[PDB]
């Protein structure tokens, strides 16, 4: 992916800074499952946008520098 | 010291030009470097038969453009004069370059 820098929405930065400016209520409703789970996202509920619903994931650490929607399966039925 | 390049579409009027032009230069001047045959520029195209999904069975096609060269030694008034305007290549353009 990226090499000199790292991709994440700028709106994710700017909206981290706000819900950090209050330590406010839960839910981040990203309408783009792209944007890396870059360090400063702590571990809050991510209702990432699938195409169907809003997959809500409680982030940990074992996932930091690796994409958000990289955690939503979307493709139903496995084997 | 005059280096003229022939850029054309068909060898026919291409050499037909080259004949009179070189002679008219030999006419109103002196020695003229004969119409050298620069390797004819040809392009490659490969389409198929019909629109409907067939991959194999086809028809190939190719672009035909022709390149040549003419030089002289003296910038005579009369050569310049004639070999300037006196032209009708219709569908052929050329390049004047110096050396």
């Amino acid at each position: 992916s990226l090499k000199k820098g790292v991709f994440v929405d700028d709106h994710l930065l700017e909206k981290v800074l706000e819900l950090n400016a209050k330590g406010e209520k839960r839910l981040i409703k990203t309408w783009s499952r792209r944007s890396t789970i870059v360090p400063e996202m702590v571990g809050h509920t991510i209702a990432v946008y699938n195409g169907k619903q809003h997959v809500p994931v409680y982030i940990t650490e074992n996932m930091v520098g690796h994409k958000l929607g990289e955690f939503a399966p979307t493709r139903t039925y496995r084997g | 010291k005059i280096r003229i390049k022939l850029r054309g579409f068909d060898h026919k009027t291409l050499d037909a030009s080259a004949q009179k032009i070189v002679e008219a230069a030999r006419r109103s001047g002196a020695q003229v470097s004969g119409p050298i045959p620069l390797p004819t520029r040809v392009r490659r195209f490969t389409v198929i038969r019909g629109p409907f999904k067939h991959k194999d069975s086809r028809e190939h096609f190719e672009l035909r453009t022709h390149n040549r060269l003419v030089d002289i030694i003296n910038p005579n008034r009369k050569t310049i004069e004639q070999l300037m305007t006196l032209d009708l290549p219709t569908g052929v353009e050329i390049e004047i370059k110096t050396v």
Partner: protein, 207 residues
Amino acid sequence: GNKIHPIGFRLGITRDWESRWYAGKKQYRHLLLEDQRIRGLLEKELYSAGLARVDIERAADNVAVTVHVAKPGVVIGRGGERIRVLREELAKLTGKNVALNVQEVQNPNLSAPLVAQRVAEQIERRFAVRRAIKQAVQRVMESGAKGAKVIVSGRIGGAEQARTEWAAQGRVPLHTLRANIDYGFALARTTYGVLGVKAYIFLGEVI
């Protein structure tokens, strides 16, 4: 049941392009585009009196609006006026330097495009196919070819089953190279569908 384009077959020395100018790799595309739009605009809004050749000579800005038409008079204008607006429509849509041409062939039944054009015209106005078309083949053979194959496909009077109709007379060797065959295709369009009109006129050897 094919027939590789007899005109695309003629490409040797038996049919010169309908566009001879210099195109240098780059500008060549836009040249082809602009020019094709000229052609296309002509073909309809210049129809009136039927043309074959859509030839154009160009180079640097210079344009040659060259046409082979089956009539010049009632397509040049009552005072050389039809040439005016049209030529300047070209010039307006192709801002450079336009130069009209209305060369005329003294024979209609010679030259397949327009022959087929009339052939399609008759059926377009709902005429009995086989009769009139076969006798049109006979018209062309009252003019003087060595062969004329004017086939006509599509819906024949409707009846769903759109076949193809056999009309011809005299030998036609479109396989042969030095045969010099003008071939012309006319689009037949009935209010009940689309029919095809192919004319094949064979001229002569030693040319």
